[PDB]
């Protein structure tokens, strides 16, 4: 069980916790702001997933400052976790290519 596979794992779980706390904090921050649409958990969660993967359809978005802060954190956790996985994949490919070379 190599580090790079532990961080990836630890990053997927952590991502899921952020998605969830994100959907939660998002609604809490957005309710109260007139015209706001990020106001029910079920969709707030879909909003999160879309933001973490950075797809950002725009059908949903925070309009308050805290909502936006929650947004920044979700984006970053998403980018960091997905980048941590591709990093784990490069450690795997790089170490194995060494094997196929003898070393």
């Amino acid at each position, epitope marked *: 069980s190599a580090l790079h596979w532990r961080a990836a794992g630890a990053a997927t779980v952590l991502l899921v916790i952020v998605l969830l706390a994100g959907s*939660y904090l998002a609604v*809490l921050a957005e*309710r109260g702001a*007139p*015209g706001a*649409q990020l*106001i029910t*958990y*079920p969709r707030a969660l879909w909003w999160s997933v879309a933001t973490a993967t950075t797809v950002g359809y725009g059908d949903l978005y925070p309009v308050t400052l805290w909502g936006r802060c929650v947004a920044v954190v979700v984006m970053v956790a998403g980018i960091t976790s997905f980048g941590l996985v591709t990093a784990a994949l490069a450690t795997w490919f790089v170490g194995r290519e060494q094997e196929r070379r003898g070393a």
Partner: antibody
Amino acid sequence: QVQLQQPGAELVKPGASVKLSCKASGYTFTSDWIHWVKQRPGHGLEWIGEIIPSYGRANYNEKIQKKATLTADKSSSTAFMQLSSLTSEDSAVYYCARERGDGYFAVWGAGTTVTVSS
Amino acid sequence: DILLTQSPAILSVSPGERVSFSCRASQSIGTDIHWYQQRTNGSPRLLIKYASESISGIPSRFSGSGSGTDFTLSINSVESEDIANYYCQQSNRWPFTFGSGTKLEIKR
């Protein structure tokens, strides 16, 4: 079983203030919001405000003159609406409902009739 | 804020007949509309959520339709117990909003 319980009624003199209650029971979650709707005789429903017990934050209907103030009590599972400095205009049936963060009110209280006279 | 227009205010229908109530929103709200029933001296009761999803415990008589800005709450075969005031409410944008209401009336 009756999920939300409210006091059948309350009497109040002008300029005074009352504190209504809504004790909930059943499947409680952290995602739960308790709402307060006001219904003057003959007229329709009117959203007053919301509060999330688990976090304790509350929002109010800014379109109307703000008279209510919401609070909650985790342990006892009771929500409170502090209406202060009332007039004849403020007397009606005040309901409370439970909303599970998905937008609709699945359960309502029997409501509390409030009269404002001397 | 979103404005739900519920007109006509009163509806007069003969028993067993089919009846339809309308709710109109100031702007597109998807299907984030919900119907409540309120009889004389009773509290509101959820009838339909998200415009078409059926609730348990509610006669199969009630059904809703619509999306966007026009929504309809139908009753297949009206009857005495269905006499009341019906309201629509939206969850699309904060704050939640209620319709002015519609009173059902039967002509026997």
